[PDB]
Structure formats: C-alpha cells, structure tokens
Amino acid sequence: NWNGQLKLLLEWNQLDLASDEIFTNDRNWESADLQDVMFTALVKDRPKFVRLFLENGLNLRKFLTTEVLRE
C-alpha cells in the first residue's frame, strides 16, 4: 500500500527521501491514483511535492474539474 506510505511522508515536508522510496521505476502510478494526494498537496501549501507529482505524469488540466475549483 504505497499510497499510505506516501501520505505519511506527505504530512512532514520531506521530498528527497520520498522521491527515492516511493517514486522508483519498478512500481507504477496514474493520475487517477494521485488525484486525492494532489488535492491535499495543494491545500497544505506543499510546492516541491506539487512539482514532484507534476513531473510523474499528472495531467493538471484534467484534474481541475469545476467541483474541485468550487471546493
């Protein structure tokens, strides 16, 4: 369950460690997987993590639906 392991490291603002452990080539991820993490990433003002999520194939125009903007 790499998602929870990622959530914990997202709480504390730690990038260098997270890149290595959760973002290696063996495992895979898609935007559908990362939408919720992205939402919190934006809300809590975690910029470098937004960079990390955008580098690894997160389509931003697809993520911003009108409901998310209302929220």
Partner: protein, 293 residues
C-alpha cells in the same frame, strides 16, 4: 503511380493527417528499402542515431540529455530510429522533435523514422489517404515503416528485421563522405530488449553509448558471481520473474556485451552528450589503424 506499382510487388500506403507510411510484410531487401526511400524523397545521411528503450518515468536531467541529442541531430542532419510508439521515452522524443521544428524551421529537418509491427497496432482503414484516430501510436513521428507480415498476437516480431536494416546502411559507400566512405552509426541505451539489441549491435561492429535502473545501469555498474551481484543490485523485481536458467542466458549476453571494450562507450554524470557521441565514433575510427596513417 510508383506507389500503386509498389503495392503490387509487396502484395495501401498513403499518408495520415489529423506523414507517409508504408506496409511491408517481411524479408524485404534492405538495399531496395533504402533505394526506395532515397528515390521517392529524402536525402543522404551524414549521421544517423539509433535508440532502444516498457514504460519509464522521465527524470529531471534525462529530458535535458535527450533534448540535447535531438538538437545535435538537427544541427548535423540525421535519422533517428525508434521502436513503435508505446508512450514513454519514445513519446517524449516525438514531442521534442515536434517542438524543435516549430522552434526553428528554416533550413533542414529531422526524421524519427520509427519501426514496428503490423500486429501490435489497432485496426486502421486500408487504402487511399485514410485518416487515423487514436497497441497505440504517437503523432509526432514522421514516418513508421510496418513489418511483421501476418500476425495478430506475435510480440516483438519486427524487432529482428529492424536491426538488419541498422547494419546495412553502414556498408554502403559514398565517396568524399568525410568519414572515408563509411556513414557513422551510434546506439543509445535508455530494458531486456535493449540488452539483446546491444548484443546484435556489437556483433554488427557498431559502437554504443550507455547512460552513466535497467541493463544499462548494470553495464555502468560493471565499469558468475559478478553477473549475479550486479543483476540483483540493479533490479530486485525484474530478476525474480526470470527463471534460473534465463539468468545463465543473461550471463552469456553480458559476457558478449563486455567482450570488446573499444566499441562500447559510457557517459559520466551541457555538452556531455556530444562529447560522448564523438568519443564513441572516434574509438571505432581509431581501432582500424587505417586512419592512423
């Protein structure tokens, strides 16, 4: 006229807009293929690159490396070779190509010239100029030559014949080419498919370049127990899927790759790409000793 003539010989090949592509089954003469490409259109090749990559996540620097590679190919005038259009690294190459053309335009152009099989792709209308709508393809590549004859589930069938063509062009001689009649050829490694193609390349006496998480990383680490240690270090999950005897086959292939040191070349962590390419070429030119005098 000539196109309709070719279809009869092959026993259909228009252009898709939304470049020109051709369909060939297999065993086509490499000389005839190159002659047709020159006859119909295009021009001679001062230098052509080949790359073998299967999803992979781009890194902050890898994009710089490959953008520089494509810029150099633009500067000199070159053909690039890629396998299919499965999105990933090759799709990024296509995007860089498309960006470069509009960025510069003016004189000259670059060609991707991708190669793949008929079976892997989804169905498409068969001729004149049938439109195409998006196992998958990339829009950036200019032309893709089609291979693999008649198959529906055969995987990586074209991967053989592609290497064959990669060997042929070198043999062709052009006077006053600035390389003594031998057009240069270089391989760039981004996994297992690249490993096999490296052995084919070396057997064809073609220098290759390897970046400083796959076979390429194992090759860099190298710079029996040795093979197994590097293999286990490079990829935990990949080795487990392979059977024990497949590891012996991997040992044999790695031994073949390391057999000759001079042809192979390695990058080290702005102009590093250009320097590596030139260095690779230079080693081959130096081995013969005919350039020495």
């Amino acid at each position: 006229d000539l196109a309709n003539f070719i279809q009869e010989n092959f026993k259909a090949f228009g252009d898709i807009q939304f470049g020109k592509y051709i369909r060939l089954s297999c065993d086509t003469d490499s000389e005839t293929l190159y002659d047709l490409m020159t006859q119909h259109w295009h021009l001679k090749t001062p230098n052509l690159v080949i790359s073998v990559t299967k999803n992979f996540a781009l890194k902050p620097r890898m994009r710089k490396i490959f953008s520089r590679l494509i810029y150099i190919a633009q500067s000199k005038g070159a053909w690039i070779f890629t396998g299919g259009t499965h999105y990933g690294l090759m799709k990024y190459i296509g995007e860089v190509v498309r960006d470069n053309t509009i960025s510069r335009s003016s004189e000259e152009n670059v060609v991707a010239i991708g190669i793949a099989a008929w079976g892997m792709i989804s169905n498409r209308e068969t001729l004149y100029l049938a439109h195409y709508i998006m196992y998958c393809l990339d829009n950036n590549h200019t032309h893709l030559l089609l291979v693999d004859n008649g198959t529906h589930g055969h995987p990586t069938i074209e991967a053989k014949v592609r290497t064959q063509l990669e060997k042929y062009i070198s043999e062709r001689v052009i006077p006053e080419s600035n390389y003594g009649g031998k057009i240069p050829i270089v391989c760039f490694a981004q996994g297992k498919e690249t490993l096999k193609s490296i052995n084919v390349a070396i057997k064809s006496k073609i220098p290759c370049v390897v970046v400083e998480g796959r076979i390429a990383d194992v090759i860099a680490s190298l710079v029996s127990s040795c093979v197994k240690e590097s293999l286990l270090r490079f990829l935990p999950r990949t080795i487990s899927r392979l059977s024990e005897e497949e590891t012996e086959s991997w040992i044999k292939w790695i031994k073949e790759v390391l057999e000759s040191p001079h042809l192979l070349t390695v990058i080290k962590i702005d102009e590093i790409v250009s320097n590596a390419i030139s260095f690779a070429l230079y080693k081959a030119f130096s081995t013969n000793e005919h350039d020495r005098d």
